[PDB]
Amino acid sequence: SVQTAATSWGTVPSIAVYTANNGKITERCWDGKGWYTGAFNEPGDNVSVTSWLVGSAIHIRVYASTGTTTTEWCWDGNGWTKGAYTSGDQTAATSWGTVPSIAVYTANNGKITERCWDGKGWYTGAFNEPGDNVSVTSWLVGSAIHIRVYASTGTTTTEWCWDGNGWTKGAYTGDQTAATSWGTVPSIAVYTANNGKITERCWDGKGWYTGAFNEPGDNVSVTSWLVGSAIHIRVYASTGTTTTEWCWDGNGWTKGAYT
């Protein structure tokens, strides 16, 4: 089945969804007025994405992997350009602040490792754990980053936590996952594709529970945004070459307009 990655920004919001299909990654875009085809078109069997705003200006980083080679592509308002990133493998990316800092996790032959950017060159991070699949989400509390990495082997997903004092195993209870988070509590939703079905586990600070989302798919991606205190979630569920968007806007899961 095709494999997707999603990011979003602002409160409209804008959404970009990257799809890897038969070794090519293409882009579909939403800015409030209909889906359209974006400019990005590069080779890849696997894709991940992160983005950040500086004022009103979006910066996008797309990580495109063939075999064991990952290429970073950069959008900074003036066309796509190849980025400095160095380390098919499967990646997950997150970013924070306006520098920004970036962490890119790679699953390669049953091991996940980490490459980091803080504005002064790529380096190897401390994270090194078993896994065939990886997803990540992060949030800031002031200047302090918190990272959650979901590492899966077979049907077992292990959560790994960075909270400024080393990687520790988290309370979360191969399958493929996607994760998003919001606020400073925070809330976290983790989607898992297992045997053609996507299910949802949720944290709001008081234990993991099963969420309401339950839809068909072999691959999943997710993005979310706040409008005030209200969370909005978009889950992209793929079977074969068909991707279905599922929308949570506080009143149940509804199918979205994505094509």
Ligand X SMILES: CCN(CC)c1ccc2c(c1)Oc1cc(N(CC)CC)ccc1C2c1ccccc1C(=O)OCCOCCOCCn1cc(CO[C@@H]2O[C@@H](C)[C@@H](O)[C@@H](O)[C@@H]2O)nn1
Helix (H) or strand (E) holding 21: strand 14-21
**Token couple for 135:** 């997803």
List the strands of the sheet with 242-248, edge to edge.
219-227, 230-239, 242-248, 253-255
Site size toward ligand X, by CB under 6 A: 35
Residue 61, interface with ligand X (CB under 6 A)?
yes
Using the contact rule CB under 6 A, the part of the chain among 16-24, 41-49, 81-89, 149-157 near ligand X is: 81-89
Q: Is 151 annotated to bind ligand?
A: no
Q: Residue 103: beta bridge partners?
A: 94, 116
**Token couple for 87:** 């380390």
**Token couple for 230:** 């209200």
The CA angle 42-47-53, to the nearest 5 degrees, is: 90
Candidates 7, 234, 236, 238: give the one binding ligand X (CB under 6 A): 234
Site track for ligand X across 105-134, x = CB under 6 A: ------------x-x---------------
Residue 88, interface with ligand X (CB under 6 A)?
no
CA distance 15 to 163: 28
Q: Is 118 annotated to bind ligand?
A: no
Residue 58, interface with ligand X (CB under 6 A)?
no
Shortest Å, Cβ 253 to ligand X:
9
Identify residue 143 by its one-letter amino acid code.
S
Q: Residue 180: beta bridge partners?
A: 189
Residue 256, interface with ligand X (CB under 6 A)?
yes
Of residues 22 and 26, the one with the C-beta less far from ligand X: 26
Residue 11 contacts residue 29 (beta carbons within 8 Å): no
CA distance 71 to 87: 10
Using the contact rule CB under 6 A, the part of the chain among 20-28, 62-70, 130-138, 166-174 near ligand X is: 166-174
Of residues 110 and 118, the one with the C-beta less far from ligand X: 118
Residue 203, interface with ligand X (CB under 6 A)?
yes
CA distance 45 to 236: 17
For binding to ligand X (CB under 6 A), which residues are involved? Answer: 15, 30, 54, 61, 72, 74, 76, 81, 83-85, 98-100, 102, 117, 119, 148, 159, 161, 170-172, 188, 203, 205, 234, 245, 247, 249, 254-258
